[PDB]
Amino acid sequence: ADNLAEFHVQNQECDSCHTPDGELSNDSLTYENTQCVSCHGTLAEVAETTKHEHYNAHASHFPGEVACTSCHSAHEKSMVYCDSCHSFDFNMPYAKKWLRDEPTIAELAKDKSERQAALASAPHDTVDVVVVGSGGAGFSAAISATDSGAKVILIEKEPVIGGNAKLAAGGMNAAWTDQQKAKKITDSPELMFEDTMKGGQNINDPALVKVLSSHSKDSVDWMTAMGADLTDVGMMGGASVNRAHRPTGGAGVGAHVVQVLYDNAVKRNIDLRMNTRGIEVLKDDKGTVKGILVKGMYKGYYWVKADAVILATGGFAKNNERVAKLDPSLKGFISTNQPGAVGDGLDVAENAGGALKDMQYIQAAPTLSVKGGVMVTEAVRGNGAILVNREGKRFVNEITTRDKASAAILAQTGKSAYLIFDDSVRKSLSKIDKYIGLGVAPTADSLVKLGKMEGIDGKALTETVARYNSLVSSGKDTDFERPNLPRALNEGNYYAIEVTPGVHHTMGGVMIDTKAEVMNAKKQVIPGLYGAGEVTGGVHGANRLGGNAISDIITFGRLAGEEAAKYS
C-alpha cells in the first residue's frame, strides 16, 4: 500500500476510523485517535512492542498524551516528529523525510478567499479569553484565568503540547523559597533582581524585573500546590547563590512542569485544541479585541468571539533567517528549539498594532552537543563540570554569563570545546544520565585514555584536572575566578562531551507593561490584548540568566490570565 489508510481498508471499513457521517471530529482528531487506541492500545502499550536499548518512538521525553496522528497520517505519507531534532534509526510505515515549511502569517494573506468567508460567518465559539500557545506561559494563563471564573479556549499550532518549555533542563529561578531554606541556602528577591539586571547589562525594564523577582517564590509555591517537585536547588551561570529549582535528584524541570500544567488543565476541563494556529487578532470599531481568526489544520479557518486574547507563542530562535538579520554573528548556527519556534506569534502581535522591543538581543546556549545536535544544560557546569579545549586546558570561568561563555568556546581551536566531569558530578544531576543514554558522553577510567579517544592532549588534560581539583580544595579559582567550586573531579570514571554554541532564546519581543498588557509604539495599551513568556520583550535585556525563562513564563503567564479574566 502507498499510505496507512489504504493498508487498513484492505480488511476494514471507513467507519473503523471515522465517525458515521465521516466528518473529522475536530482539529485534535480526538475521535479518530481514540479509534487507533481501541485497536492498538495506548501509546504506552504500543511502546512495549517497539523498544530499542537507548530509545523508543512511543516512549519519549514529551509530556501529555501524544496523539498517534502526530506522526501517523492516514491518506498520505507522514513524518516522524522526533526527526526534527534527532536522527534515530526508525522504520515507520509510510514515512517521508522530515521537512518543516509552514507558511508565514504574511503568506497566509493569499487565503483572502477562505478568510473572508470565515469572518462573514458566525463565531464558532464565544468565550471569555482565548490563549495562544501551549507552552509554560500559555498553560499558566489558561489555568489562572479559569480559576478566576473565565471561560477559556487554549490553542496550539503543533501536533504536540509544550513548545520549548517541555525541553527545559536546568531549572526555574526563585528567591527566597521554603525549598531553598530546606537546603540551607540564603537568598532574597532583591539579590535575584540585582543579579538579573546586572546579567542583562542593565538593559532590562526594571519594572518587569521587579515583577519577575518579587513574584518568583509565589510561582514556585503555585506550581508546587498543583503537584510539582521543585525541591532540588542548583546553581546556574551569573547567579550569586543556588536558586535554580528542579525535581529531586536533578531531573529536567521542563518536561515535569509542563506535565503538571497539562494534568491541571485536564482536571479543570479546559478546552485545548491541537493543530490550531492563531492567525489574526480581531478588533472592534473602537480598537479593543473582539476575537481571533484561527486556522485548523483539518477543519480550516474559523473565528472565536472573546473579550481578551493572550499571546503566549514563544520566541523565534528556530528561524535562523530572522535571527541572522537581527544578529549576523549567529547566521548558520544550529538551534536548540522545537521546529515551530519561528516567531509567527510576534507577527500576529504586530499586525494587531503591538510594538516590538529589544529584538536585536538574541542568546546562544554555550553548550550544544556537537555529536547529538541537542542542548546540554548549563546545570552540568553548575553542578561542577569544567570546560577544556583541544589543548587540554581550561580557558573560561564555566559559570559566567552565556554571552561570555559562548564567545570563549567559539574562540578555541576548532570553535568547540569539551565538558569534562566525573561520576561525582554525574551522580549529583540525573539529567546527565540522559546524555549518556543519547551516546554523546564518551567515558574512560583515566583522562589519558579519554583524551586519546576524543583528540584532547591526554597529558595536559590530566594535569589540568589535578590542578583544578587543587583550586577546589583550596577554595579559590586563581586561574579563571570561577566563584563557586562545588565538587572535585575525582570519583570513578571520567566523561567528555564535545560542545559548541547554538541559537536558543530571543530576549526581545512584544512590548508589555507590568500587567502583561500589550502596547503600541505610542506606549498606549491595546485593550483586550496580552503577552506572556518568551514572546515578550523587556524582561531579560541584553542577556538572559539561565533559569530565568521558566520563572518568567509561570509568573507572567499566571498574571496575564488573571488580568484577562478581570478585564473579562
Ligand X SMILES: Cc1cc2nc3c(=O)[nH]c(=O)nc-3n(C[C@H](O)[C@H](O)[C@H](O)COP(=O)(O)OP(=O)(O)OC[C@H]3O[C@@H](n4cnc5c(N)ncnc54)[C@H](O)[C@@H]3O)c2cc1C
Ligand Y SMILES: O=C(O)/C=C/C(=O)O
List of residues 6+ apart from 146 with CB closer than 8 A: 152, 268, 270, 561
Three-state DSSP at 529 gives strand
What's the closest the beta carbon of residue 422 comes to ligand HEC, in angstroms? Answer: 20
What's the closest the beta carbon of residue 271 comes to ligand X, in angstroms? Answer: 14
What's the closest the beta carbon of residue 292 comes to ligand Y, in angstroms? Answer: 29
What's the closest the beta carbon of residue 550 comes to ligand X, in angstroms? Answer: 4
Task: Pick what 39 binds: ligand HEC, Na ion, ligand X, none; C-beta below 5 to 8 Å, kind-dependent.
Answer: ligand HEC
What's the closest the beta carbon of residue 507 comes to Na ion, in angstroms? Answer: 5
CB atoms within 10 A of CB 334: 18
Identify which of residues 176 and 316 has a Cβ nearer to ligand HEC in the complex.
Answer: 316
Q: Parallel, antiparallel, or unpaired: how do β-strands 525-531 and 517-519 relate?
A: antiparallel
Shortest-Cβ-distance residue relative to Na ion: 509
Task: Pick what 340 binds: ligand Y, ligand HEC, ligand X, none; C-beta below 5 to 8 Å, kind-dependent.
Answer: ligand X
Indicate if the alpha-carbon torsion angle 404, 405, 407, 412 is positive or negative.
positive
Shortest-Cβ-distance residue relative to ligand Y: 170
Given the rule CB under 6 A, which residues bind ligand HEC?
Answer: 4-5, 7-9, 12, 14, 16-18, 24, 29, 32, 35-37, 39-40, 43, 46, 49-50, 54-55, 57-58, 60-62, 66, 68-76, 80-82, 84-86, 90-93, 167, 169, 252, 298, 338, 374-375, 431, 434-435, 437-438
Three-state DSSP at 93 gives coil
Identify which of residues 92 and 444 has a Cβ nearer to ligand HEC in the complex.
Answer: 92
Catalytic residue of the set 243, 277, 402, 426:
402
- Is residue 558 annotated as a catalytic residue, yes or no? no
Task: Pick what 16 binds: ligand HEC, Na ion, ligand X, none; C-beta below 5 to 8 Å, kind-dependent.
Answer: ligand HEC
CA distance 100 to 357: 28
Task: Pick what 134 binds: ligand HEC, ligand Y, ligand X, none; C-beta below 5 to 8 Å, kind-dependent.
Answer: ligand X
Please choose, from the candidates 356, 365, 362, the residue with its C-alpha nearest in 3D space to the C-alpha of residue 325: 362
Identify which of residues 234 and 384 has a Cβ nearer to ligand X in the complex.
Answer: 234
Please choose, from the candidates 341, 317, 304, the residue with its C-alpha nearest in 3D space to the C-alpha of residue 100: 341
Expressed in angstroms, the distance from the first to the final Cα of the chain is: 52
Please choose, from the candidates 429, 430, 483, the residue with its C-alpha nearest in 3D space to the C-alpha of residue 241: 483
Work out the angle between the directed axes of helices 189-199 and 206-225 (0-180°, nearest 10).
130
Identify which of residues 16 and 360 has a Cβ nearer to ligand HEC in the complex.
Answer: 16
Identify which of residues 200 and 345 has a Cβ nearer to ligand X in the complex.
Answer: 345
Please choose, from the candidates 537, 536, 517, 520, the residue with its C-alpha nearest in 3D space to the C-alpha of residue 528: 517
Task: Pick what 158 binds: ligand X, ligand Y, ligand HEC, none; C-beta below 5 to 8 Å, kind-dependent.
Answer: ligand X
List of residues 6+ apart from 296 with CB closer than 8 A: 26, 27, 273, 275, 276, 302
> Is 156 within 8 Å of 273 (Cβ atoms)?
yes
Given the rule CB under 6 A, which residues bind ligand Y?
Answer: 169-170, 365, 377-379, 546-547, 549
Q: Parallel, antiparallel, or unpaired: how do β-strands 386-388 and 525-531 relate?
A: unpaired
Identify which of residues 33 and 219 has a Cβ nearer to ligand X in the complex.
Answer: 219
Task: Pick what 312 binds: ligand X, Na ion, ligand Y, none; C-beta below 5 to 8 Å, kind-dependent.
Answer: ligand X
> Is 498 within 8 Å of 370 (Cβ atoms)?
yes
CA distance 326 to 317: 11
Identify which of residues 384 and 509 has a Cβ nearer to Na ion in the complex.
Answer: 509
Task: Pick what 509 binds: Na ion, ligand Y, ligand X, none; C-beta below 5 to 8 Å, kind-dependent.
Answer: Na ion
Task: Pick what 70 binds: ligand HEC, Na ion, ligand Y, none; C-beta below 5 to 8 Å, kind-dependent.
Answer: ligand HEC
Alpha helices in 78-148 (DSSP H): 112-120, 136-147
Q: Which residues pair with 496 in a beta bridge?
A: 420
Task: Pick what 273 binds: ligand Y, ligand HEC, Na ion, none; C-beta below 5 to 8 Å, kind-dependent.
Answer: none
List of residues 6+ apart from 306 with CB closer than 8 A: 126, 127, 128, 129, 130, 153, 289, 290, 291, 292
Residue 424 has which C-alpha cell?
A: 561525582
Identify which of residues 60 and 148 has a Cβ nearer to ligand HEC in the complex.
Answer: 60
Amino acid identity of residue 564, one-letter, is: A
Identify which of residues 280 and 378 has a Cβ nearer to ligand Y in the complex.
Answer: 378
Given the rule CB under 6 A, which residues bind ligand X?
Answer: 132-138, 155-158, 163-165, 167-171, 253-254, 277-278, 312-314, 336-337, 340-341, 344-345, 348, 375, 505, 533-535, 546-550, 553
What's the closest the beta carbon of residue 544 comes to ligand Y, in angstroms? Answer: 7
Task: Pick what 403 binds: Na ion, ligand Y, ligand X, none; C-beta below 5 to 8 Å, kind-dependent.
Answer: none
Please enumerate, as own/partner, the contacts of 522-527 that have beta carbons within 8 Å and a separation of 24 or more: 526/283, 526/287, 526/288, 526/289, 526/352, 526/353, 526/354, 527/287, 527/288, 527/289, 527/567
Given the rule CB under 5 A, which residues bind Na ion?
Answer: 506, 509, 534
Identify which of residues 167 and 311 has a Cβ nearer to ligand Y in the complex.
Answer: 167
- Give Dmax (Cα) for the chain: 76
Annotated catalytic sites, by residue?
402
